[PDB]
Amino acid sequence: SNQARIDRMNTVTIKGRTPGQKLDRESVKNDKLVITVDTVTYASTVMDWQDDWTSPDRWAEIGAQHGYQHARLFDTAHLIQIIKARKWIAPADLKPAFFDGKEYTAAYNADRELFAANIIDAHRQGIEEMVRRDLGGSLTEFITVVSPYVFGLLLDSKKLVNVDYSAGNGNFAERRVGMVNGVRIVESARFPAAAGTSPLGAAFTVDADDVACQMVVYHPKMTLVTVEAKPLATNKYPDNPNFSDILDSFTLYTVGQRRPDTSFAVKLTNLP
Amino acid sequence: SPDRWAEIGAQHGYQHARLFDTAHLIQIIKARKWIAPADLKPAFFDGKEYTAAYNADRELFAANIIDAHRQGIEEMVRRDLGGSLTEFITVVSPYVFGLLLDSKKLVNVDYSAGNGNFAERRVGMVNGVRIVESARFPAAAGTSPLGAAFTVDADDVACQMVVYHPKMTLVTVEAKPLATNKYPDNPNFSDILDSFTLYTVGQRRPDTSFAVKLTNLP
Amino acid sequence: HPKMTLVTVEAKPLATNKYPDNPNFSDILDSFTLYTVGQRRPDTSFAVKLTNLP
Amino acid sequence: SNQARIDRMNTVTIKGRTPGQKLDRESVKNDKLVITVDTVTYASTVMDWQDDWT
Amino acid sequence: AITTGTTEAQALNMTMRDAVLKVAPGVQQLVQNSSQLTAAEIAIIQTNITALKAAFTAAGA
Amino acid sequence: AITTGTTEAQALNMTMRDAVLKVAPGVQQLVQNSSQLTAAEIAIIQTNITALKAAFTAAGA
Amino acid sequence: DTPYKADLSRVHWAGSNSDVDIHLEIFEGDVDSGFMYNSFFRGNSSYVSVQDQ
C-alpha cells in the first residue's frame, strides 16, 4: 500500500471515597495518524555506442556523482520537516497527555556577545519547558543542530568557553565547542538558504519565516517517522534498437511528524 | 477491537506515582503557618516564611532569592540545629533552579570552587545545603482527592522553594498498599479494572522547616 | 446460487454461558451471537411476484 | 474489526491483426464492497435455587 | 477562509472531520448494494448531509 | 430528495460518492499534523469542498 | 509523455477515471500515550503501619 497508521490514547484521573460509597468510572479517548507517499525522485544519463568506442571511460565518475545528490536531498528534507513542527495546536480530546509545538525568538544586536546571550536565553527557555514535561531524565538523548553562522556566534558568548564557568568545554582559537545547557551540539550545512520549492513535493516549500530558524532540538527516536515504498536502486541497460546505453537511479519515500511535543525551534529576528 | 489493557494498567500506576510526590510537598508548603500551643511554647517555635522580590534583571532576582534562603538558614542556626546542616534538603522548581545558575558567585571559581558548571547545568549546594530539582509543585488553586486538609490557596501556589529535615518533619501512616483487581460482571455485559490504596501524611515538627515566596510575578 | 449470491460476516459464533448470581439467590443461562448478512452478486438471482391478490 | 472488504474488477476484449500492424492496449477499472455488524441477538432464562433443589 | 493558527480554529477544523467521516460510510452503501435502501435510512443520510453543510459554513470553508 | 432505482439516479449517486472521498483525506491532514498547512495546499481542499457542494446540489441531497 | 498514459490500469483507483483513492492502511504494534513517571520522595519520612489494628 502507500499508507501507514499509528494510534493515540489518553490518560486517567484519581478520586476519593469513604465507607458506604460506590466507585465512579470514566471514559478514555483515542485517535489516529496517517502518512502517504506521493513522488519519485530520479536522475538519468544516456550515451552513444560510437562515442563510447572512441573516448576514455567515464562511467565510474558519473556513477559516483549520482549518489551525492540523493544524500544531500535526504538530509535537506529531514531538516526541513524538523523545522516545520513549531506551529501544531493539540486537540482538546488529548490535552492532558499531548502538548503543543513551541517557538522562541532571539533579538538581533550589533554586538556579538549580546546576540549570543539572547540565543542562550531562548535555548534555556526551551530546555526548561522540556524539563517541565517529565522528560528531564532523558536529556542525554536529545540533539541540537545549528547552522555555521550560529555555531560561530556561540563561541563569542561570555561563557561556555571561559574556564571560570565551563572548564573543559571549548576553545576560542581552535573553533571548538561541545555542549550547551546539557545537550550536544552538531554543525550541519544542509539548512535551507532561500525561499523556494523542492523536487520532493509541495509539502517541502519554505518561505521567509522558515529560513530564519537556524537552531532546532529534537529526540532522534520519537519525533519523525519515515515511510518507504522503494529503496534507492540503480540499473544500467542497453537500448538495442537505438544504438545507445542508459543509466538510471530512483527511489520513493517520504517523511512525517510523529510527536511534535518533543522538539522546539529558535528564530532570529530583525536581521539586516 | 484489539486489546488495550496493558497501557491502561501502566497509566493507572503512573498517575498514583505522580500524586504521591505532590501530596508530599503540599504538606510542607503548609507548615509555614503553624503556631505552637501555649503550654509547649518555650521548647517549640513557630514556623517561618520569607519573601523574594521580582525584578526585570535576572541576576538581581537570583540575589533576592539567595538572601531569602540565607535568612532562613541563619534562623535555623539559632535553634541549635546548625550542627546538622548536612541532613537538610532543598527542593527547587525548574524555574528557580534555572535562576540560580545565572548568579555569578555560586558557579564562578574564584568563589565556591568545585561547585557547579554552567555549560552542563550542574549546581551542588547553596548556603551549605544541597539542592534537588522537582516538577511536582502545584500549578493552580483547587481541591485535592485526599480531603479538605490538602486544599491550596493562591498564596501557597507562589512558594517554589522549600527546606525540610527528612527524618523529623513529616510522618506517614499507611493502612493498605497499592493493589489491583480485574473481574467480569456476569449479570451485565462489561469488564472492569480497579486500583486503590489508603494512607495519609501528617506533620510532626513544623519548626524544622521554612518556605520562600516569590512576589509580584507578572 | 448457493455459492455466489450472499456473504456472511461473523464477529462471534454462537456461544453459551451459565453462571450463578449469589446476592439474588438465582441462576441464569444465556446464549448470544453477533453476525450479519449481505449481497455479494445480485446478478445470479431473481424473484417472482404475485399480483392482484384478494 | 467490525467490517470486511471485497474487491471488484472489470474484464477485457479480444482483437486481431495482420502482419505489420501494432497492438492496442485497454484500461481496466476497479471498485470495492464493504459490510458491517452492529446488532446482537440473544436468549435468556432464569431459575431460583429453592425450585432447583426440588 | 480556512485558518489553522489558534485553538478557536482548531475546534472548527476538528468538528468538520467527524462531521464528514459520518457521511463517508453511507454513500458507499447507497451504491454498492440494494440491501440498505429503505426510506427510513435515506432519512438518516439526509440529516447527516444537512449537518455537514452547517459544519462547513461554521468552519468558513 | 435522494432517489434510487434508475440509471440517472445511479449516475448522480456515483458522482456524489466519488466527490466525497476526495475531501475525506484532506481534512484528516488538516488537523493531524503541521507539515501540510501551507497556504498553497489549502487551496486544493477549497476547490474539493466547492465541487462537493455542487455535487450535493446536483444529486438533490 | 509516455505513449501508455491513456491506457494505464490502476489497481486501487476507482471512479469514471482512476482518481479516487481506496487503498488499505498498514498497521503494526504502535501506540502513543502519556510519558512515564516514578516516585522519588518515598524514603524521606517516618513511617508507621496500622493496617489491621
Author numbering:
A (entry chain B): 56 to 327
B (entry chain A): 110 to 327
C (entry chain G): 274 to 327
D (entry chain G): 56 to 109
E (entry chain H), F (entry chain I): 2 to 62
G (entry chain A): 3 to 55
From the article:
Podophages that infect gram-negative bacteria, such as Pectobacterium pathogen ΦM1, encode tail assemblies too short to extend across the complex gram-negative cell wall.
Two decoration proteins, gp44 and gp43, are individually expressed off the viral genome and bind across MCPs at the 2-fold and quasi-2-fold axes of symmetry via formation of homodimeric α-helical bundles, where each dimerization domain consists of a helix–turn–helix motif. The gp44 consists only of the α-claw motif, which we refer to as the α-claw protein. Gp43, however, also encodes a long helical fiber that we term the “forearm” domain. We refer to gp43 as the α-paw protein. While the α-claw is a small protein (∼6 kDa) and is composed primarily of two α-helices, the α-paw is nearly three times the size (∼17 kDa), due to the long C-terminal forearm domain. The α-claw and α-paw decoration proteins, although similar in the helix–turn–helix domain, may serve different functions during infection by virtue of their structures. In contrast, the α-paw likely contributes to stability to a lesser extent but may mediate additional functions via the fibrous α-paw forearm domain, such as host recognition and adhesion.
